[PDB]
Each structure stands twice: as C-alpha cells, then as structure tokens.
Amino acid sequence: NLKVEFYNSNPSDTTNSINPQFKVTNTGSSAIDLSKLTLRYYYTVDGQKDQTFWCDHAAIIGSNGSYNGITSNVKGTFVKMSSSTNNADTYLEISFTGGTLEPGAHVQIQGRFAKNDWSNYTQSNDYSFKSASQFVEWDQVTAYLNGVLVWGKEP
Amino acid sequence: NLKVEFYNSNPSDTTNSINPQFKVTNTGSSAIDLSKLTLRYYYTVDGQKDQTFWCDHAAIIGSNGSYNGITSNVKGTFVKMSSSTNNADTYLEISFTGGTLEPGAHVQIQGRFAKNDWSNYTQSNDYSFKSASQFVEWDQVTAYLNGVLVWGKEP
Numbered sequence: 171n172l173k174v175e176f177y178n179s180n181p182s183d184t185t186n187s188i189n190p191q192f193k194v195t196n197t198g199s200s201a202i203d204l205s206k207l208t209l210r211y212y213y214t215v216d217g218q219k220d221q222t223f224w225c226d227h228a229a230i231i232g233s234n235g236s237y238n239g240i241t242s243n244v245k246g247t248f249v250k251m252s253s254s255t256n257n258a259d260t261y262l263e264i265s266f267t268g269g270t271l272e273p274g275a276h277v278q279i280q281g282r283f284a285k286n287d288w289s290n291y292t293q294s295n296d297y298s299f300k301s302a303s304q305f306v307e308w309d310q311v312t313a314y315l316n317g318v319l320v321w322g323k324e325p
Numbered sequence: 326n327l328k329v330e331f332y333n334s335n336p337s338d339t340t341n342s343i344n345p346q347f348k349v350t351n352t353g354s355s356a357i358d359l360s361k362l363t364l365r366y367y368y369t370v371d372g373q374k375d376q377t378f379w380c381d382h383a384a385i386i387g388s389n390g391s392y393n394g395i396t397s398n399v400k401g402t403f404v405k406m407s408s409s410t411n412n413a414d415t416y417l418e419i420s421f422t423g424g425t426l427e428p429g430a431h432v433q434i435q436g437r438f439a440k441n442d443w444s445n446y447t448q449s450n451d452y453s454f455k456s457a458s459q460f461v462e463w464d465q466v467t468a469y470l471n472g473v474l475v476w477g478k479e480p
C-alpha cells in the first residue's frame with residue numbers, strides 16, 4: 171500500500187530541464203522492497219532527442235525521522251510510448267537499485283532531466299506536470315509494485 | 326487508413342495454444358509502411374509463464390490478387406498489462422520487420438502462441454477472443470500506426 175505526493179520545482183512553461191519531485195510513503199503494515207517499486211512521469215518530448223536523468227538528492231525518512239541517503243540508488247530511463255496521447259508520448263520511469271521502505275517510512279526524490287543538446291521542452295502540454303511549492307496528492311503520476319499499477323491514472 | 330478483420334481458428338475453451346488470425350486491409354489512398362504497424366490481442370494468461378509466438382503463415386495480397394509471402398517478417402511479443410480487467414491482463418503485440426502495404430492490398434497473418442511449458446489457457450475470459458469460420462470485423466483487437474491507435478477499443 172502506497173501514497174504518492176508530487177510537484178515540479180521548475181514551473182517555467184518553456185525550459186531546458188524538467189524537475190520532478192516525488193514523495194512516496196509506505197502506508198501499509200509490511201515493508202516494501204524498493205527494487206520492486208517504479209514511478210512514472212508522463213509528458214511530450216517536443217522534439218525527440220536522447221535524454222539524461224539525474225537525481226539531485228534522494229533519501230529514506232523513517233517514521234521517527236531517521237535519515238538514510240540513497241541518492242545514487244535512484245535510476246531513470248526514458249520510454250517512448252507505444253500508444254500516445256496529445257499530452258503524453260514519453261515517460262520517465264524512475265527505479266531503485268535496492269533498499270527497504272518500512273511501514274510509515276517515505277522516500278523523497280529530487281529529480282531532474284534534460285535533452286542531451288539542452289534544447290527546450292514545453293511543460294503546458296505534459297500530462298504529469300504539476301507546479302506547486304510542496305508535495306501535493308496528484309494522480310497524474312503513477313507508481314507500480316512489481317509492474318502492477320498501485321497509484322495514479324495512466325494517460 | 327485501415328480495416329482489421331479477425332478470428333480465432335482454435336475455438337476450444339481449454340487449450341494449450343491460442344490461434345489469432347488477422348486480416349489488415351489498406352483502405353486508404355497511400356501505401357502503409359508495415360514497420361510502423363502493430364496489432365494487439367488482449368487476454369488473461371491464466372497462470373503467468375513465458376510465452377512464444379509463431380507465425381504459421383503470413384502474406385501480402387494485392388488488389389489484383391498478387392501473392393507475396395512474408396511469414397518470417399512477422400514478430401510477436403508479450404506485454405503484461407500494469408492495469409488489468411476481468412478479461413485482460415496480457416497482450417500479444419504483433420509487429421513487422423518490414424514491408425509495404427499498397428492501397429487496396431491486405432496482409433493475412435496466421436498466428437499461434439503458447440506457454441513455454443505448454444500449460445493450458447482458458448479462452449472464455451479473454452477480451453479479444455472471437456471464434457468464427459472466417460475473418461469478421463471485430464473491434465476488440467487493436468491496431469496502431471506510428472504509435473497512434475487507429476482501430477478497435479482497448480480494454
């Protein structure tokens with residue numbers, strides 16, 4: 171059982187970097203294996219180019235406030251959709267090499283990606299885009315446990 | 326522009342091989358690049374196992390009756406759905422390495438797939454199942470051209 175909160179820290183309509191911020195909480199009674207957890211951010215690439223994802227910072231925060239830095243365990247891959255919509259033709263899929271999300275604990279991921287030539291994106295035609303000053307409950311981003319959708323609405 | 330006709334040549338409710346038969350007609354005025362066309366057959370795996378697809382026979386038939394064998398250009402892959410329904414948790418996606426479908430021409434595909442342990446399937450709970458003696462207009466199978474849905478209803 172999971173709860174996903176999210177926001178984009180870069181609100182510029184035209185920009186050369188998209189900054190997705192994820193906060194995933196294990197609201198269940200049993201621990202979660204992060205290597206089985208994947209997250210997706212849907213958008214339109216606006217000119218297909220190879221892209222790169224970077225995790226500025228990621229950490230597992232326990233229910234008692236314990237801090238475990240896992241920045242280098244977060245990986246990002248770009249998937250071109252086999253069936254697209256007018257505001258979603260590509261998605262960034264976030265994965266973890268390992269780690270355990272214990273009951274009540276949560277993981278914060280401060281992400282960022284860009285095209286390899288640093289050309290612009292347009293964020294107003296991106297399905298998952300959500301400008302906010304903090305993590306909000308947003309269902310236009312999805313989460314999966316072993317390939318099964320457990321949060322959000324796919325486009 | 327396309328038209329998809331279809332039928333299953335194996336009607337057995339319990340069986341260890343599913344036989345989808347596709348007939349795709351280029352009803353438009355311009356030729357179609359087959360490497361840009363994909364087709365889907367939705368069903369419930371009834372016990373997750375790796376699966377294999379075989380094209381028994383495939384051919385491009387021209388409006389003048391011309392015959393061009395393309396059996397080895399037809400590929401099939403199995404995709405497990407992230408979100409499933411009571412009659413769809415997996416889909417066979419059919420692709421073509423190449424070929425061009427001229428206006429008025431159609432391509433016939435006699436396919437078959439099975440689990441790698443040859444265990445049974447149940448066809449009564451499969452979204453795309455359509456038993457018939459010949460190809461019928463069926464919208465429970467989908468076709469995508471350039472990653473865009475151009476035929477059928479997805480579950």
Ligand SMILES: [Ca+2]
Pocket residue numbers: 213214215216291292293294295296
């Ligand atoms: Ca965009």
Ligand SMILES: [Ca+2]
Pocket residue numbers: 368369370371446447448449450451
């Ligand atoms: Ca079945």
